[PDB]
């Protein structure tokens, strides 16, 4: 939603994106976040680090 | 900014790992047996990691306010607050 809008008017729209929502569990959507600190605190620390 | 506001993680080259090292460990020793003082260049070497008391070398010679930033010469001990044995 940010990179689409990056292209959306900067170049022309440069054929931004086509996507489709996907459904993932709560733990799966938990570890899959951005901040590596929170994820590393949650569980499975070795792997994320 | 006076306050850090990002945190990053990365691999440590053998040139960073040396840059962190205030010395080098050579013999598997921790502490003298009869008297409990640290040993020369083991795992508690006060010459590397730091002094034990505050503003006082190990051999106890350089013990006075006249000399603070000073580095003793009998033992290689520096002279500074013991609070560096953790960093």
């Amino acid at each position: 939603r940010i990179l689409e809008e990056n292209d959306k008017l900067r170049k022309q729209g440069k054929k931004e994106v086509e996507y489709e929502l996907v459904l993932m569990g709560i733990t799966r959507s938990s570890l899959s976040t951005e901040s590596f600190l929170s994820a590393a605190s949650f569980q499975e620390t070795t792997r994320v680090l | 900014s006076k306050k850090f506001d990002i945190i990053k993680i990365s691999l440590a080259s053998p040139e960073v790992i040396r840059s962190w090292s205030h010395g080098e460990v050579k013999k598997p020793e921790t502490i003298n047996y009869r008297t409990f003082k640290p040993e020369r260049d083991g795992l508690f070497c006060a010459k590397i990691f730091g002094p034990i008391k505050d503003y006082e070398c190990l051999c106890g010679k350089y013990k006075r306010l006249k000399h603070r930033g000073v580095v003793c010469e009998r033992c290689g001990v520096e002279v500074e607050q013991a609070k560096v044995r953790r960093e």
Partner: protein, 196 residues
């Protein structure tokens, strides 16, 4: 080398001997961490990225190129960061300030070591004996045994129990290795950072 062998070609001892017989020099097949490190070292990226991206441009990822997708990301990351990929094989490992693995004396005229002191005290004298051996020019069998014992102690220090039958002290407990301090409910994150 001109010899028709392949780079990442495992060779048994006798087949290796026969390669030595028929071709002598012009190729080296060493064993041990130096081998892996040399391989990772002489592994050009731009020789490989596009070469694999073209096999992925041959996209039939039903079962085969469902595999080759990750290597793209890995090799791109290693290019993006600026990290020498051979750095994943250590040549000098650091030690921890002593006041994080203390030896304070307590009642009963006794002392309280930390489990890290022991693993350190092991890796050290194993390195020492290794240096002494390499000096004295011993036969290669015991050279191998030392060079392997060392790897074992290093892995134990990092996190024992990942591969073997993790070492124990006299009390027969599996020792509390380095990584075992920053995970688990009793570890470091959800114990003393959200605890207090």
């Amino acid at each position: 080398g001109m010899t028709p062998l392949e780079k990442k070609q495992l060779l048994t001892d006798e087949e290796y001997a026969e390669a030595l017989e028929n071709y002598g020099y012009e190729f080296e097949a060493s064993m041990g961490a130096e081998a892996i490190r040399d391989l990772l070292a002489d592994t050009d990226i731009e020789s490989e990225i596009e070469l694999l991206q073209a096999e992925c441009e041959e996209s039939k990822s039903t079962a085969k190129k469902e595999k080759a997708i990750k290597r793209l990301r890995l090799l791109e990351t290693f290019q993006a960061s600026g990290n020498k990929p051979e750095w994943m094989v250590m040549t000098v490992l650091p030690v921890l300030p002593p006041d994080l693995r203390p030896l304070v004396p307590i009642e009963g005229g006794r002392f309280a070591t930390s489990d890290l002191n022991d693993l350190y005290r092991r890796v050290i004298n194993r390195n020492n004996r290794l240096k002494k051996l390499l000096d004295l020019n011993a036969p290669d069998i015991i050279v191998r045994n030392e060079k392997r014992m060392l790897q074992e102690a290093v892995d134990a220090l990092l996190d024992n129990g990942r591969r073997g039958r993790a070492v124990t002290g006299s009390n027969k407990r599996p020792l509390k290795s380095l990584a075992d301090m920053i995970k688990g409910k009793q570890g470091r994150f959800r114990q003393n950072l959200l605890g207090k």
